[PDB]
Amino acid sequence: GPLSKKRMIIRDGVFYAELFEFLKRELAEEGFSGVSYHVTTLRTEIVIKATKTREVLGVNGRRIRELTACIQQRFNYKEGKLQLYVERVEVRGLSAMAQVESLRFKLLSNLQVRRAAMGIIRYVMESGAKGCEVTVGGKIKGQRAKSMTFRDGYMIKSGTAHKSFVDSACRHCYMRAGCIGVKVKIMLPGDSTGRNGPSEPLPDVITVIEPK
Amino acid sequence: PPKAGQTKKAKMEAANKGAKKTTKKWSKGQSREALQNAVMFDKETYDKLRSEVPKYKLITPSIISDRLKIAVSIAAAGLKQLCREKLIRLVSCSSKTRVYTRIVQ
């Protein structure tokens, strides 16, 4: 029987959740910045966003075919019905998932916490971001655990508008003494096109037309 | 947990063994006298209903029971009969409640 329309979207959501999780673990070393799919009658067209496009494709498209085999076998895709593409992030410093993975890799490379977190913040605001906040917590200064937050710029924290103007991501960094949690929130600037911006004015800002 | 200080197992055991019954009765109560109401009509009681119950300004099954020392179930039955013979008239009526009154002249 056809699944109820309320059961088809649940299946579609659960499938995307698993697909997102698989690529997060597989493409952690690259700046995996989301995945989108477009199911048509002929194929599926799964598209992967990452900062290091060359590292996810491999040589002569080796790794992207390994990922295609992974998804094909997991979800039982007939041959030729699944296609995978990878596209580059327009602004690397405006992606919280790419910046949080960069920060986690810095910490695992024995970088200093204040130096690494500060280095992320400058790069984020060199890219045109309105604000940025980086949080690092865990066993940084000894047996006792402390959480240190570094801020710069604007950042709204209340209401629902902060879910469309702020890009956020968190990661677990497993160090020798224990796991360390890193959070990166980036307040996106507005865009006329909306390609890498919320594309709407701030909910509280009120501009007045200059008389002509 | 609030583990009581210096409380024994013998202290525990003696506490539950003495905790049966005893403390109760937080209300005064103020018992009442029983109501001896007849469930069927006697000759003299039925005579009162046919004569004394009319020419009452307000007639109600609970009132008649308070006068003739009878149950309300048969007090209402007699009132329905007195209406069938037009001795009393029914002013207010429902399934649960009936009000009667004496006829004029």
Binding site: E200, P201, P203, D204, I206, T207, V208, I209, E210 | -
Partner: protein, 71 residues
């Protein structure tokens, strides 16, 4: 409690400065002017601005108002 916050008061002072000639003593015609000379995500704030612009205009007709500069 119906105080106009500083976002409404500042924006309504900007509108009076820029479009004093077009404004009036009534809410509904002024609110129409506020609709196209302002960009805001919220209709409620545009409604509160139109209410305070009319309050400024009634204040201006009686005398000068601090915070409003008309050349």
């Amino acid at each position: 409690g119906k105080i106009r916050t500083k976002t409404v008061k500042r924006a309504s002072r900007q509108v009076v400065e820029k479009y004093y000639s077009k404004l009036n003593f009534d809410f509904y015609q002024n609110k129409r002017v506020i609709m196209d000379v302002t960009i805001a995500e919220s209709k409620k704030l545009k409604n509160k601005i139109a209410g305070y612009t009319t309050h400024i205009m009634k204040r201006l007709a009686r005398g000068p108002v601090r915070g409003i500069s008309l050349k």
